[PDB]
Amino acid sequence: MADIGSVLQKEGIEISEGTGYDLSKEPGAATVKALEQGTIVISYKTTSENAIQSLLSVGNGTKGNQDRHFHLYITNAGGVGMELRNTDGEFKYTLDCPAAVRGSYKGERVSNTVALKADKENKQYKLFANGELIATLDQEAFKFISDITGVDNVMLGGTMRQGTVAYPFGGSIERMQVYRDVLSDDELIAVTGK
Amino acid sequence: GSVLQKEGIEISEGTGYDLSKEPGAATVKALEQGTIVISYKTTSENAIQSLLSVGNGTKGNQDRHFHLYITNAGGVGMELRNTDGEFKYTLDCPAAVRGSYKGERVSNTVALKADKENKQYKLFANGELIATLDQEAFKFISDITGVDNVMLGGTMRQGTVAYPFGGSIERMQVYRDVLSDDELIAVTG
Ligand SMILES: CC(=O)N[C@H]1[C@H]([C@H](O)[C@H](O)CO)O[C@@](OC[C@H]2O[C@@H](O[C@H]3[C@H](O)[C@@H](O)[C@H](O)O[C@@H]3CO)[C@H](O)[C@@H](O)[C@H]2O)(C(=O)O)C[C@@H]1O
Ligand SMILES: CC(=O)N[C@H]1[C@H]([C@H](O)[C@H](O)CO)O[C@@](OC[C@H]2O[C@@H](O[C@H]3[C@H](O)[C@@H](O)[C@H](O)O[C@@H]3CO)[C@H](O)[C@@H](O)[C@H]2O)(C(=O)O)C[C@@H]1O
């Protein structure tokens, strides 16, 4: 990891439900909007009982393009997932893992760390939470962010759908990093388990 | 040997075909792992068409089922569900089967295996492995709460036939055994 660098990073970002936090103008956003593969690592605390809370999304926010996006999300039941979409006629690749994260511990909102990697070489997606590899998906027709049509935004804490903040998170994004590099499972186990 | 097999079952769009009373249905309703192989011809433009389902058809339990389905866009998928709070494990693969081709309906063969030891699901269509899913928390049909039916051509949801297929289920076989990838490439060809 000594010479690995993120293409986009943010730290210490509070977000109330429905507000989101726009990253579209950040240096590095263009790179994120074109990823063919890579790694996303996010530490957060959720204060929200919303059922589906996007931590990070990248997609097409325009009218009629509401099924064209990627997001990495958590749920109110302690689930972690992702969706990678370009309308269902093109692709809808998803993961949803139960009982992988926690909202609270000893009456306090607890930090969790999750990660997703997408590896073009072996057509594989892997999801991690809190020190564990929780799911692996292989697709013959591999896709990633550069396959979504008309990407125009990157954001924390929701997914833009026809100009509305969908899948709204509340709480704190403690640390968020996006890499073009595909990090090893050992690295992701270590960073998510810390 | 299969635990349940049927051949030449033609289904009017929306009706389904109940297998719940067949010999072997109990075993299918309790599978911890296994393999499903289905050759079919669809004659329907319905968006989502279950080929085979196993689930809980009772009121309030509409998210408790397994099905292997095709779509009108040439997709193949499966969902394994016991309400989203418990599990929702899915696959959806584009451009894997044909709904029609040279203005004609056409046969396809698909397969799904669920492998408990490897904690793995693999989906096949027409001689190709199209997706693999590995879940740390492996589930299958015996983890669904209140299974009470097995059907071709739809999924029972609160007493309604959801995801309705129309056409012919040419051959369907369900195994408790986990077939090899090579065997599934061959049988789906
Ligand atoms: C993470 C997750 O569950 N995301 C799904 C999302 C959420 O469950 C809800 O938004 C939470 O309220 O639901 C999505 O589906 C709902 C929409 O479906 C649209 O129809 C789909 C149809 O179901 C597909 O079979 C078809 O291929 O595409 C249609 C068009 O998108 C309805 O038109 C729309 O009104 C909603 O009901 C969603 O996109 O919001 C699916 C997410 O995977
Ligand atoms: C193969 C497939 O696409 N299956 C999905 C199915 C189909 O897209 C549609 O049925 C085709 O018309 O849609 C399902 O979701 C629709 C229902 O969602 C319900 O709310 C969900 C909510 O979206 C989840 O986030 C939550 O965890 O669970 C809720 C309760 O199920 C609505 O209550 C209901 O009215 C439908 O809109 C479906 O179950 O039918 C999801 C399938 O994966």
What order do the helices and strands come in, and which of them pair?
Two copies of one chain form a homodimer.
Chain A: E1 8-15, E2 21-22, H1 29-32, E3 38-46, E4 52-59, E5 68-75, E6 80-86, E7 92-97, E8 104-105, E9 108-109, E10 112-119, E11 124-129, E12 132-139, E13 153-156, E14 159-161, E15 164-166, E16 171-179, H2 185-192
Antiparallel strand pairs in A: 1-16, 2-13, 3-10, 3-16, 4-5, 4-13, 5-6, 6-7, 8-9, 10-11, 11-12, 14-15
The complex binds a molecule of 3 linked components (BGC-GAL-SIA) (2 copies).
**Main sheet attributes: strand count, strand direction, barrel closure of chain A:** 6 strands, antiparallel
Helix content of chain A: under 10%
Question: What proportion of the residues of chain A form beta strands (DSSP E)?
Answer: over 45%
Order of helices and strands of chain A: EEHEEEEEEEEEEEEEEH
Oligomer state equals homodimer
Anisotropy-based shape of chain A = globular
- What bound compounds does this protein have? a molecule of 3 linked components (BGC-GAL-SIA)
Distance between the termini of chain A: 16 Å
CATH class of chain A: Mainly Beta
The radius of gyration of chain A is 15 Å
The domain count of chain A comes to: 1
The most extensive contact between chains is: A-B, 24 and 24 residues
Query: What is the β-strand count of chain A?
Result: 16
- The CATH architecture category of chain A equals Sandwich
Biggest β-sheet: strands ordered side by side in the sheet of chain A: 1-16-3-10-11-12
CATH topology of chain A: Jelly Rolls
Protein name (chain B): exo-alpha-sialidase
Family (chain B): Belongs to the glycosyl hydrolase 33 family.
Organism (chain B): Mediterraneibacter gnavus (strain ATCC 29149 / DSM 114966 / JCM 6515 / VPI C7-9)
PDB class: sugar binding protein
